[PDB]
Amino acid sequence: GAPATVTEQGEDITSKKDRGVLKIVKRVGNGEETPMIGDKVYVHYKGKLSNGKKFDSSHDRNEPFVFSLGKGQVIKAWDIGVATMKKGEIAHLLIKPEYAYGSAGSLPKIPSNATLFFEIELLDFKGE
Numbered sequence: 692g693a694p695a696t697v698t699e700q701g702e703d704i705t706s707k708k709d710r711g712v713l714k715i716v717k718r719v720g721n722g723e724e725t726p727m728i729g730d731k732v733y734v735h736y737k738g739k740l741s742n743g744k745k746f747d748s749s750h751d752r753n754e755p756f757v758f759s760l761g762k763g764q765v766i767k768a769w770d771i772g773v774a775t776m777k778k779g780e781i782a783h784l785l786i787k788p789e790y791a792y793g794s795a796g797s798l799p800k801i802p803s804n805a806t807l808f809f810e811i812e813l814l815d816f817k818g819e
């Protein structure tokens with residue numbers, strides 16, 4: 692499956708290099724630039740628990756998911772992961788709970804200690 696590939700071939704983009712966020716590029720984006728902290732970012736995404744029938748696709752080619760990068764508007768894994776993406780890039784992330792919802796989780800949506808899988812398209816990014 693897609694998680695499997697990321698495990699085996701994903702690059703660990705954490706700082707602590709603890710394999711807490713593994714990334715694969717599925718489609719290469721355009722030019723070289725990627726977003727700075729405080730850039731407003733526009734993405735499509737979908738996600739699932741790795742071992743779970745929770746799935747999320749609210750922003751799956753419907754409306755863009757927008758947030759401001761590294762302001763903590765999202766889980767650490769996204770502040771980390773999306774920061775690395777070019778405009779037009781699509782990527783898979785596999786995410787240990789420590790870079791997501793941790794032992795607390797986010798009941799009932801996310802259980803305690805969840806690993807998450809996301810497929811993210813970076814549509815665009817703008818200076819705050």
Ligand SMILES: COc1ccc(CC[C@@H](OC(=O)[C@@H]2CCCCN2C(=O)[C@H](c2cc(OC)c(OC)c(OC)c2)c2ccc(Cl)s2)c2cccc(OCC(=O)O)c2)cc1OC
Nearest residue numbers: 738739740745746747749758763764765766769792797800
């Ligand atoms: C900095 O730490 C956090 C920041 C934000 C939160 C809330 C969860 C936070 O969720 C996320 O960080 C991740 C990555 C971005 C996509 C949404 N995320 C999710 O995990 C997904 C999510 C989770 C949701 O509830 C947890 C959620 O509820 C509204 C949601 O709505 C669309 C989507 C998932 C649900 C089930 C999965 Cl399985 S994955 C969040 C949810 C919705 C929007 C959002 O930002 C944009 C906006 O508000 O419009 C931020 C928890 C945080 O810590 C746990």
